[PDB]
């Protein structure tokens, strides 16, 4: 899964949160089998050798678009012909099933940018205000 | 994933002629850093007075890019109805990551139109439309310019007072002179500017009657809308692919005068777009009042390291490609623009390969898949020397449960070539997988 | 492979950084003393000589 | 595209006669018509321009009439120059589709066709290919029909039809068959003839040679 | 690893296909099995800018000799300006600035070498 | 660095470093070159026998 | 006035390209346009691509788009036409037409029209010396008071070819007939002359083939 579905940007503060909620999500479907693309790789058009593609971080592989957004079944192969701007040759993505669970476990990854200066992700709370000329800029981003 | 406007309905596709010996009479428009042409502009921070050296998407300075300019109708004398389209649609191009484009270069500036060489209309104001899509394959006609994957599209409306950009995956329609209709030569987008451009009148339905005859836009997942201010300069649009999804960035908004380029807004895609294609926009109109628009010029973004100086007023005017020169290396250096007359040490040259000469009986597998397997502890070791080896077929012949390579590359070990091959076999557990290790604290 | 070819060239260039650091500070400290050597020459062709 | 249709294919008329040629036009073609006039062995000359207006160097007697779908050129006296191609063109669209051409026959003189049939030659023989040459002379009518039957048999494909180009002082035609066999199916067959029928003739008359 | 092969003495016990010399580069013996060639290691040319700030004139220098076999904008030479590049009398380098060196002229001026000074009216005093 | 251009990507985060070294040089090898016209100076400016 | 010549008529293989060549003689050639329109049988007149020469752009039709490529030089004004894959289809006589109109090429009228140049497609045929089939004197050839006898040229390639009898002495009664394609692929035509058979016995009618290709001149008895 992190080498051909989901790698987080190691530049970004990077946080991995895994959580199940039984009864709070009544509102969020449950996906028949939860999926993942257990190999992905690149067939070269003479055949002699086949290239594994790692997925890049935080990025839709060229693999993905050709398995359906869950896999039929584990062990499944997809293949197409690439075009010719493609380069030819064949693309190859495997991917594996696993069973829903009783109650839905969702992963989530979390990069806070510290780039930027247009805008500020704070929680919320005259003293905060400028009527202190003393010591503390504390501003939107920035403390 | 609603649609604003209904589906297959009206007409069928206009006629559309195809010339390309019209099209692409070529003015030149090499991209300048000095005059800040182009300049993505940091994101992140301001500076004033300040000159700093910042690395980010940048397109490369000298870049001529690529010219696509958009042509009046046919215009029959008793009719101005009949439409013709360039093969910019058939003008798809890959770019790895980035797009800049350059809008109204020459404005209000004597021109002739494409559709006739011999009439001459003045330049006028107009805005660029395409469709970038991450994989692109034949049409059922079999001409190039077919998008499986999911495409974003931006189409002006209202003669460029308005922009759309929706999420719709476009789906071909069986109407003569459209993509699954026999006999059908190009696909691209029409205007109609008695209802669409009246005066005081501006139709957003315009980006609708194109869908309405050329194809049919399915899983319309985002539908955005943003005002044009079309005052009649025109500066710079930008669109980035980061991970996130794609940014929209406009010049004018930040500030018209400079041509600075800021991101004005921002629409999530989760899949990554590789190809850029260009839909051909043509509005039909009289011979008497056709229109000659100028043309937009597109440039590949690359990561670069540039030198930027920033004004008292916080706006760039003036930039630096280290990349494009030794003395341009040497300011990016000193990070000073003017540097003192000297002779400086640069880059030095290196040569390039030309006549390859490679140095190089065939090693066998057979004792590892044949009889009866030792157990982990009484592992047996396989030698290969003096032979040539293919791992390829090994890695076919058995599905690899687990594959950890440690001081080497996975895909190194097939292709590397060294003194001598050592292979291992034994029987291993699945609940032991996890504890076997080159080095483990469990023994 | 590209995880380790990223952690051999980042120690590689880290320990190269160290030597020209260490080559450009014993350079300085050379022609610092040729620099002084020069001055005793001009005043032996201004005496001896 | 529009599609131009020429009603007449081929027309008959004495000289000094009226001849009216209908244009039909899928698409409307307001006043966007050309009418060439094409001459065997020499370019085609420009008539009328818009289908409304006599080109300059075009006799008076050709005219243009007619609007939109339907166009008609009148030719108010034939001449000799007159019995050519007509072609009525669209100039309404980028891609213009040619009229399919309507010709122009001299009704001066009516004359029955004259059939005779001559043997290969001996180098023909020893060639290894036979040709029978089946010849019809001055036939008025362009129209006619020539089959080959041979030990009472019909012979398709290996019989080719050549015509000579019009005499111009009877109006007639002179047009050769000539059917080819192989050796040994020249030699087996005994009987061969060719049958014509023909519109000015009053009877269909058979040429017929026995073998030897 | 980028080599190139002239004739050479032979050398080596022959019992190994590799010499080396101290260092992990390879004299690279006996490239040829039939006979010995020794190898040569990558060989490349420097680049000086000799730039006049008032003048806004640069030019392209090289080591020691280019006159011999160098030539400007050379296939075999990947990188100059990193984009494009920037005929002369040899000297010190091939220097893309012309107009040569005089026998006789003003002392002072940039340091370049033994004999050539860098003026700025793109001009080389001596 | 190495010459693969991987490597120069990686040397530009450390670039700031590696043009400061440049600099420093640069200056060493001016000093030498103004040392040594001091010293030939020194040396001329005295009136010659053929 | 301006005069429009084309090229003399040429036979290209397939698979090679053709070049046809229109040359305008007086007027104005930059701001006129010319137009190349070619007449095929059963096809009718169908226009290939338009061109201007001072615009130097060229309209090509779409269905021969990609395939034509349509130049015009000032200094020789002439317009060149390349035709490249020959097929039997493609095969027909090439027009150039000038519209009368300086541009506006999508209303075109032509005023004037070329002679035209005919192109034929050659799969593995090469000239050589025709051979000619006399027909002879029988009383089935006999009809009447007049026997018609004629000499068949067949087995010739390239150019129409001069057919004469009696070295060009007899004119009267003779019937032209056009070239038709073999299974062979070289062209074979008729000359029947009909004339009194006891003018057959009071002169020797010879029959003269000249084949212009192969420069060979053949006459024998008919």
């Known amino acids: 899964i992190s080498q051909f579905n989901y790698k987080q940007s190691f530049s970004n503060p990077t946080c991995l949160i895994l959580a199940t909620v039984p009864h709070n999500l009544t509102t969020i479907t449950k996906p028949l089998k939860y999926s993942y693309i257990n190999k992905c790789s690149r067939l070269l058009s003479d055949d002699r050798t086949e290239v594994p593609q790692l997925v890049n971080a935080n990025q839709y592989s060229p693999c993905v678009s050709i398995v359906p957004s869950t896999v039929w079944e584990d062990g499944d192969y997809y293949r197409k012909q690439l075009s010719p701007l493609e380069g030819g040759g064949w693309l190859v993505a495997s991917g594996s099933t696993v069973a829903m669970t009783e109650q839905l476990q969702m992963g989530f990854g979390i990069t806070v940018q510290y780039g930027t200066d247009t805008n500020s992700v704070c929680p919320k709370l005259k003293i905060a205000s400028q009527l202190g000329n003393c010591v503390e800029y504390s501003l939107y981003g920035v403390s | 994933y609603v649609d604003v406007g209904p589906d297959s309905v009206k007409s069928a596709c206009i006629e559309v002629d195809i010339q390309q010996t019209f099209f692409d009479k070529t003015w030149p428009r090499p991209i300048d850093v000095s005059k800040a042409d182009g300049i993505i502009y940091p994101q992140g921070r301001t500076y004033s007075n300040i000159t700093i050296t910042y690395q980010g998407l940048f397109p490369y300075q000298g870049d001529h890019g690529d010219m696509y300019v958009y042509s009046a109708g046919h215009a029959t004398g008793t009719t101005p109805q009949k439409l013709f389209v360039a093969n910019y649609s058939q003008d798809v191009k890959q770019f790895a990551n980035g797009f800049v484009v350059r809008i109204g270069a020459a404005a209000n500036s004597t021109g002739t139109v494409i559709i006739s060489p011999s009439t001459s209309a003045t330049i006028r104001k107009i805005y660029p439309a395409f469709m970038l899509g991450s994989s692109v394959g034949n049409f059922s006609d079999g001409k190039m310019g077919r998008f499986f994957n999911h495409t974003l599209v931006l189409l002006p409306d209202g003669c460029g007072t308005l922009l759309r950009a929706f999420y719709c995956i476009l789906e071909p329609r069986s109407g003569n002179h459209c993509p699954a209709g026999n006999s059908y030569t190009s696909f691209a987008t029409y205007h109609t500017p008695a209802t669409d451009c009246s005066d005081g009148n501006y139709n957003r339905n315009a980006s609708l009657n194109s869908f309405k005859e050329y194809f049919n836009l399915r899983n319309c997942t985002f539908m955005y809308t943003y005002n044009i201010t079309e005052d009649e300069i025109l500066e710079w649009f930008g669109i980035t692919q980061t991970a996130q999804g794609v940014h929209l960035f406009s010049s004018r908004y930040v500030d018209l005068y400079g041509g600075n380029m800021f991101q004005f807004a921002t629409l999530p895609v989760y899949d990554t777009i590789k190809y850029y294609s260009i839909i051909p926009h043509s509005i039909r109109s009289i011979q008497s009042d056709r229109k000659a628009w100028a043309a937009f010029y597109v440039y590949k973004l690359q990561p670069l390291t540039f030198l930027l100086d920033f004004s008292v007023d916080g706006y760039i005017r003036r930039a630096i490609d280290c990349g494009f020169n030794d003395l341009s290396q040497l300011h990016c250096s000193y990070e000073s623009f003017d540097v003192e007359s000297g002779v400086y040490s640069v880059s030095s040259f290196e040569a390039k390969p030309s006549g390859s000469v490679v140095e190089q009986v065939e090693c066998d597998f057979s004792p590892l898949l044949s009889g009866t397997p030792p157990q982990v502890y009484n592992f047996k070791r396989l030698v290969f020397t003096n032979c040539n080896y293919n791992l390829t077929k090994l890695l076919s012949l058995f599905s690899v449960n687990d594959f950890t390579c440690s001081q080497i590359s996975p895909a190194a070990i097939a292709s590397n070539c060294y003194s001598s091959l050592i292979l291992d076999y034994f029987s291993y557990p699945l609940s032991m997988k996890s504890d076997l290790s080159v080095s483990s604290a469990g023994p | 492979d590209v995880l380790e070819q990223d952690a051999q060239i980042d120690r590689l260039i880290n320990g190269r950084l160290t030597t020209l650091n260490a080559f450009v500070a014993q350079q300085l400290v050379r022609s610092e003393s040729a620099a002084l050597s020069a001055q005793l020459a001009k005043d032996k062709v201004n005496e001896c000589v | 595209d529009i599609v131009m249709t020429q009603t007449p294919s081929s027309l008959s008329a004495s000289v000094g006669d009226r001849v009216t040629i209908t244009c039909r036009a899928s698409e409307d073609i307001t006043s966007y018509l050309n009418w060439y006039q094409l001459k065997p062995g020499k370019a085609p000359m420009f008539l009328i321009y818009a289908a409304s207006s006599l080109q300059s160097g075009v006799p008076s007697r050709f005219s243009g009439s007619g609007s939109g779908t339907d166009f008609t050129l009148t030719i108010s006296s034939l001449q000799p120059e007159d019995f050519a191609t007509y072609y009525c063109q669209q100039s309404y669209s980028t891609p213009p589709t040619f009229g399919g051409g309507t010709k122009v026959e001299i009704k001066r003189t009516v004359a029955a066709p004259s059939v005779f049939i001559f043997p290969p030659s001996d180098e023909q023989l020893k060639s290894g290919t036979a040709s029978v040459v089946c010849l019809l002379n001055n036939f008025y009518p362009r129209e006619a029909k020539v089959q080959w039957k041979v030990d009472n048999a019909l012979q398709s494909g290996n019989s080719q039809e050549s015509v000579t180009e019009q005499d111009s002082k009877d109006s007639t035609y002179s047009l050769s068959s000539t059917l080819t066999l192989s050796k040994a199916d020249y030699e087996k067959h005994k009987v061969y003839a060719c049958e014509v029928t023909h519109q000015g003739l009053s009877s269909p008359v058979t040429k017929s040679f026995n073998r030897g | 690893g980028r080599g190139v092969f002239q004739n050479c003495t032979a050398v080596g016990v022959r019992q190994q296909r590799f010499v080396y010399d101290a260092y992990q580069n390879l004299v690279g013996y006996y490239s040829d099995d039939g006979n010995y060639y020794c190898l040569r290691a990558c060989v490349s040319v420097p680049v000086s800018v000799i730039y006049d700030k008032e003048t806004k004139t640069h030019a392209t220098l090289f080591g020691s000799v280019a006159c011999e076999h160098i030539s400007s904008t050379m296939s075999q030479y990947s990188r100059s300006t990193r984009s494009m590049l920037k005929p002369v009398g040899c000297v010190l380098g091939l220097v893309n600035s012309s107009l040569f060196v005089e026998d006789c002229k003003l002392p002072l001026g940039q340091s370049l070498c033994a004999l050539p000074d860098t003026p700025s009216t793109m001009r080389l005093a001596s | 660095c190495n010459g693969f251009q991987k490597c120069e990507q990686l040397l530009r985060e450390y670039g700031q470093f590696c043009s400061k070294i440049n600099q420093a040089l640069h200056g060493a090898n001016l000093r030498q070159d103004d040392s040594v016209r001091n010293l030939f100076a020194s040396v001329k400016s005295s009136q010659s026998s053929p | 006035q301006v005069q429009l010549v084309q090229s003399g008529a040429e036979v290209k293989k397939p698979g090679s390209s053709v070049k046809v060549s229109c040359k305008a003689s007086?007027?104005?050639?930059?701001?006129?346009?010319i137009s190349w329109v070619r007449q095929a049988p059963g096809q009718g007149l169908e226009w290939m691509g338009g061109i201007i020469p001072i615009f130097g752009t060229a309209n090509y039709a779409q269905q021969f788009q990609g395939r034509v490529t349509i130049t015009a030089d000032e200094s020789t004004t002439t317009a060149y036409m390349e035709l490249s894959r020959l097929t039997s289809e493609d095969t027909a006589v090439y027009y150039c037409?000038?519209?009368?109109?300086?541009?506006?090429?999508?209303?075109?009228?032509?005023?004037?029209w070329g002679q035209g140049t005919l192109v034929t497609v050659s799969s593995a045929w090469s000239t050589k010396g025709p051979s000619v089939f006399p027909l002879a004197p029988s009383s089935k050839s006999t009809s009447g008071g007049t026997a018609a006898l004629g000499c068949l040229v067949k087995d010739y390639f390239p150019e129409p070819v001069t057919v004469s009898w009696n070295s060009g002495a007899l004119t009267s009664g003779v019937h032209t007939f056009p070239a038709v394609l073999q299974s062979s692929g070289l062209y074979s035509l008729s000359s029947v002359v009909t004339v009194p058979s006891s003018s057959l016995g009071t002169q020797t009618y010879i029959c003269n083939v000249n084949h212009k290709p192969s420069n060979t001149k053949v006459d024998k008895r008919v």
């Open positions: 007086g007027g104005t050639f930059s701001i006129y346009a």
């Open positions: 037409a000038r519209q009368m109109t300086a541009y506006d090429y999508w209303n075109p009228s032509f005023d004037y």
